[PDB]
């Protein structure tokens, strides 16, 4: 299938109480593989997945230097942006950055991205064409002029289109085995009396990947049903995901309901019945 690689950066200022907290993490799909935390003693880009560990000292040195330079730039930007907005020095503020690329099964570029936020709000972003910028407000307009003036789009396109994909391909191959791939949900139904009136049916989907999935209830098939509960998809902590949907049913009449599970890993959609 297709995959992606993303780097996430977060710099938070804590005025009068030290320097901006800087946290950076690399992603391949949903797997974290590298990280940097300004509070860590090492002050190094650290491995987080077994397949990136085999990288030599040349790799780690260069990553550490380049990630450290990023934090310095964020530090400076924080000051600059506060200035743009006329915000007071006492306030804490956040810069978030995400960039990376998507590639197909053949390892070719599909698209690249780069977007920045200030205090949880769109600030400036590289457009799809990887050639133009979109500024979210008058302040970002300033940054936009600077970045155009500096031809920053060209060198970014050279990375997103070039280096980025080349390394994603390396990562994907290196950790093809260990990297999380298609896993069918393990499904089951549970029964929970609230009264004897009145009982709860819960449909479980466990250990599935990717996270994309569909759980739907039916009474007296084929009759779709709302009035149900449905928790957000959540990570199991081992690369797979969990989810459940529930419905309150009259002690009847439990058996007239069916749960329906859809996931790309299943040969066929599943139908569960109590």
């Amino acid at each position: 299938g297709s995959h992606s690689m993303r780097y996430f950066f977060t710099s938070v200022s804590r005025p009068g109480r030290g320097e901006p907290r800087f946290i950076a993490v690399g992603y391949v799909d949903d797997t974290q593989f590298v990280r940097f935390d300004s509070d860590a003693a090492s002050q190094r880009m650290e491995p987080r997945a077994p397949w990136i560990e085999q990288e030599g000292p040349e790799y780690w040195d260069q990553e550490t230097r380049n990630v450290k330079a990023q934090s310095q730039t964020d530090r400076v930007d924080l000051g600059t942006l506060r200035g743009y907005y006329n915000q007071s020095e006492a306030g804490s503020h956040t810069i978030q950055i995400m960039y990376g690329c998507d590639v197909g099964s053949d390892g070719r570029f599909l698209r690249g991205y780069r977007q920045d936020a200030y205090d949880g709000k769109d600030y400036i972003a590289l457009n799809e064409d990887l050639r133009s910028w979109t500024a979210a407000d008058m302040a970002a307009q300033i940054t936009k002029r600077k970045w155009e003036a500096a031809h920053e789009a060209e060198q970014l396109r050279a990375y997103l289109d070039g280096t980025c994909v080349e390394w994603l391909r390396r990562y994907l191959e290196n950790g093809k085995e260990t990297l999380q791939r298609t896993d069918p949900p393990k499904t089951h139904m549970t029964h929970h009396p609230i009264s004897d009136h009145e009982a709860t049916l819960r449909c479980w989907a466990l250990g599935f990947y990717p996270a994309e999935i569909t759980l739907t209830w039916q009474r007296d098939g084929e009759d779709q049903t709302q009035d149900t509960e449905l928790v957000e998809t959540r990570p199991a902590g081992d690369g797979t995901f969990q989810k459940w949907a529930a419905v309150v049913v009259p002690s009847g009449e439990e058996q007239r309901y069916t749960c329906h599970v859809q996931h790309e890993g299943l040969p066929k959609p599943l139908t569960l019945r109590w």
């Binding site: 990553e63 380049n66 400076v76 300033i142 920053e152 060198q155 970014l156 990375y159 280096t163």
Partner: peptide, 10 residues
């Protein structure tokens, strides 16, 4: 691998 240098100051 991250880019060789960061974006110029905002």
């Amino acid at each position: 691998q991250v880019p060789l240098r960061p974006m110029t100051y905002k």
